[PDB]
Each structure stands twice: as structure tokens, then as C-alpha cells.
Amino acid sequence: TDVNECLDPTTCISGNCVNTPGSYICDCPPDFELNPTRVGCVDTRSGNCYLDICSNEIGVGVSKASCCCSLGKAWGTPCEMCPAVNTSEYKILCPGGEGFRPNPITVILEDIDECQELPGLCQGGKCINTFGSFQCRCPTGYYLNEDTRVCD
Numbered sequence: 001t002d003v004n005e006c007l008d009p010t011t012c013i014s015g016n017c018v019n020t021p022g023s024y025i026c027d028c029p030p031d032f033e034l035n036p037t038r039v040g041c042v043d044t045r046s047g048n049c050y051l052d053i054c055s056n057e058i059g060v061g062v063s064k065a066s067c068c069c070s071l072g073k074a075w076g077t078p079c080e081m082c083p084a085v086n087t088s089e090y091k092i093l094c095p096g097g098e099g100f101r102p103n104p105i106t107v108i109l110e111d112i113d114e115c116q117e118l119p120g121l122c123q124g125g126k127c128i129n130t131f132g133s134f135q136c137r138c139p140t141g142y143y144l145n146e147d148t149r150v151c152d
């Protein structure tokens with residue numbers, strides 16, 4: 001009877017909690033929707049990921065969080081600018097900070113595999129995924145352009 005679950009910080013990942021007598025509801029901001037177990041909010045749309053304002057495509061048909069919580073700068077069609085890293089929108093989209101995104105079914109944070117999802121981060125090179133990051137090695141004679149993410 002005394003219980004307001006919205007006071008629990010685990011409650012309603014990336015959503016707004018509203019207390020109810022024996023439970024609680026999670027209201028999801030625009031572009032997010034409640035997950036199957038109703039513990040949080042995820043964006044399940046698919047769109048292209050871009051390194052620039054939209055251009056310089058680095059992934060195809062990925063989620064907005066996979067794009068924007070990694071090195072993507074814009075996403076989707078029409079283009080949606082990734083939220084800046086010190087905003088409330090980034091907090092909701094990227095609740096684990098950079099490198100990670102919530103699993104769309106369980107909302108548990110998981111590494112983004114940049115090599116699988118954003119292969120354009122190492123074009124012409126060899127990508128190795130890591131936990132929270134990735135590495136790109138360019139083949140002999142070629143060098144990573146830090147700006148376009150192309151080997152040469």
C-alpha cells in the first residue's frame with residue numbers, strides 16, 4: 001500500500017513512471033515504445049546511420065541507438081540528428097553511455113557491434129569489435145582517414 005515504485009531508480013528505463021496502486025505505468029517519450037515486459041522504452045525503428053549532418057553512410061537498417069550511441073552523427077529518413085552527448089535526450093536513448101544500447105526485447109544494455117552494424121566506420125579496413133568500442137586496422141600501404149573513416 002505505501003509503495004511508489006517511481007521512487008526506485010531502476011523503474012522505467014528511458015521512460016516516465018506513473019505510480020498506480022499495486023504497480024506502475026511507464027510512459028515512453030516520442031519515438032520510443034514500451035518493451036514486451038513493460039520495464040522500459042526502446043526505439044525499434046530501423047534507418048541508415050550517417051557520419052555527417054545526412055551523408056557518409058556507415059550502416060544500413062540499424063536502430064537509432066546503435067547508430068547514435070556509437071559514432072553515428074545522424075540517422076533515418078528523413079534524417080534525424082543524433083542527440084548531443086550532454087542532453088536529456090541522449091540520456092534516454094543511450095542509458096549506458098557511449099558504446100552500448102538496450103536490447104530491444106529485454107532493455108538490458110549490450111555492446112554495439114560496430115563491425116556488424118556500422119561497417120562504414122572502417123571502410124577498406126579490418127574491424128575488430130570490442131566491449132564498448134572497436135578497432136580499425138587499415139591494410140598495408142593505406143591509412144585511416146580519421147574524418148571519413150575510410151582507409152585512405
Ligand SMILES: [Ca+2]
Nearest residue numbers: 112130132133
Ligand atoms: Ca563494440
